[model samples]
Target: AQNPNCNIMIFHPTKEEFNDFDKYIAYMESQGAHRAGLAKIIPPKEWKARETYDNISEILIATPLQQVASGRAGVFTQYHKKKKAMTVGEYRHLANSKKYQTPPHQNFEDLERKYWKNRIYNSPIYGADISGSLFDENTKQWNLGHLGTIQDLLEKECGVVIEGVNTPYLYFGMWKTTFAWHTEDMDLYSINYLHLGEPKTWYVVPPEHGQRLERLARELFPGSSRGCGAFLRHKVALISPTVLKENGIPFNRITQEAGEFMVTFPYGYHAGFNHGFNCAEAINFATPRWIDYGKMASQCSCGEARVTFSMDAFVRILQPERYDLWKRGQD
Candidate 1:
């Protein structure tokens, strides 16, 4: 259930400013023309996207392992090595252990200091949801003209009113923290808003060339050739835009600032690194246009089957609402 009186702030164009929802939708739906751009947004005063966490160090130091485990907090080490999942207590013990105090772990103290100082250097915390804890109930406030986009309408029609997948995922990033080239789940649309801190640099590839880029990525980093059947697949591959440019693939870059919203369209492959310490919230939603692509992604041999939602299920749920509209039009 949602808190009916909860209010969440968002950025959207007004009818007077844009005037044509159809044109706006078409512009957003177009694959390559405008893949990524920043928009001015206003956040609510009560919205504590950053303050809720206060300082990264304190949370890491004081938060219990049970809380971290239940909260699904992921911790990483130098070179983005994902440490074995452990409770916050275990993580603290391991970080301060004598084994990690030398040579390979020389940077442990530095990383810890960075976190305490609120200057996250290498570690990136992802998939943290603030739906009820930090932000208001997302579903009840959907129609408050916060996100006046077709994606919102379609999601509401499909009965997906939950957090994480439907609601925003909190990302805490610091210098050199990077998210490698990847498309949103099942080619759906995504909107990322910088809640606070330094700007994030993004490199985006158009939908038309998504497959080509994927093929090139596979060729460049062949897990099969490495003799590991998807088991040792590289999670993050920093693909330079220059490489894609040299190969004749069109791409664009943008530095998203605080309070700016960045929207990525269907099949738009994007990657980026944080210039400095920053916090951002990203959410994914689908439109009717994504149905075909979701179907294709669902059947592909790639590992997306594990992550992508059921296209058939979405369509089945959507059909009744679609028919209702059709019947209303007939009358």
Candidate 2:
């Protein structure tokens, strides 16, 4: 349910233009990219053949079986009751086979339970410790390790490596595999790169409409929100742009192809599906400005996943380490 009335900003930066990731991002934001809630970056032509990544066959080959998910869309349907796991190779083979090739309906009216996909989600790509980070030293363009763009100051300032935040996470997807509508933890910025294979169709609501999306989601899935404050964080709901449009919320869609990048702004609500077999890497990062947003998000009643990282410690280190400020902390 893509709304034709909206378009996300797209930038095709030459090598030199993209050399300074921070400067380029500033340039994009200056060009009114914040209005779209996300931007698309098509790297220089040479990058098409020069992507550096871990050997998936070796790293993920022996990975444990994942729960099976059939085609995903609209509402968290109990299509399959969780008993599904084949090896990455086995999943890939079945994912490409015609045994489950059902054409998508014009409207997102149901879920596909027949053709299953083994979604390798939230798994670390850089060996848990992130000692094996990937990036081309030749061209720091998509260099995840050192991209200062809006600077992910987590590890540098906080003195810790939070997997899937400061560290990268790998994801495997097949046709119709979907991520439910939600904002990133603590509303930090997240960048996702398609490492190999098919495009992912992403639907994003502008920053302002984030609440509207949540309200509709709450209305759509009241049971989930009954006892939860940040119900969207549960990752169990999806709504169509059609429903949003009728509710007067704006929406934009983008097709993220291989060798490309997509950055979601802080608190920007987004969700999407895979076109076919593909692998992608994603991680959360924050600009210094995120300190305030992180503070507000930390106060939620449902509570932050303390297992992830200590937001208070992050803020303490990020803010003054002096006794004078500590005395009047709330002031």
- For model 2 the TM-score comes to 0.72
List candidate 1 segments past 4 Å from native. 1-165, 224-235, 298-331
lDDT of 1 by residue, 1-331 (tens): 1212211212455434244433554544342233332223333433323334433332332221111111111222122333334433343344344532212223433433333233222244332233312233452222112444434555555556432224445565545456666676546677676766666777776666666666666666565324322311223455555467667766666567785667676777777656444567776655566656654541222332233233334433434444343233323
Alpha-carbon runs more than 4 Å astray in model 2: 1-7, 48-55, 61-73, 77-87, 100-139, 148-165, 298-307, 310-312, 315-331
Q: Which residue pairs come into collision in candidate 1?
A: 65-88
Q: Report the Cα lDDT for candidate 2.
A: 0.59
What lDDT does candidate 1 reach at residue 32? 24
| True-vs-predicted CA distance for residue 219, candidate 2, Å | 1.3
Q: Model 2, range 229-329, lDDT digits (tens) per residue?
A: 67676554666555667777778877898889998877788987776677777777776556566555522234422224433444444443432343243
lDDT of each: 0.46, 0.59
TM-score (all chains, Cα) for each model: 0.55, 0.72
- CA lDDT, candidate 1, residue 248: 70
Instruction: Report the Cα lDDT for residue 266, model 1.
Output: 72
Lowest lDDT block of 10, candidate 1? 64-73
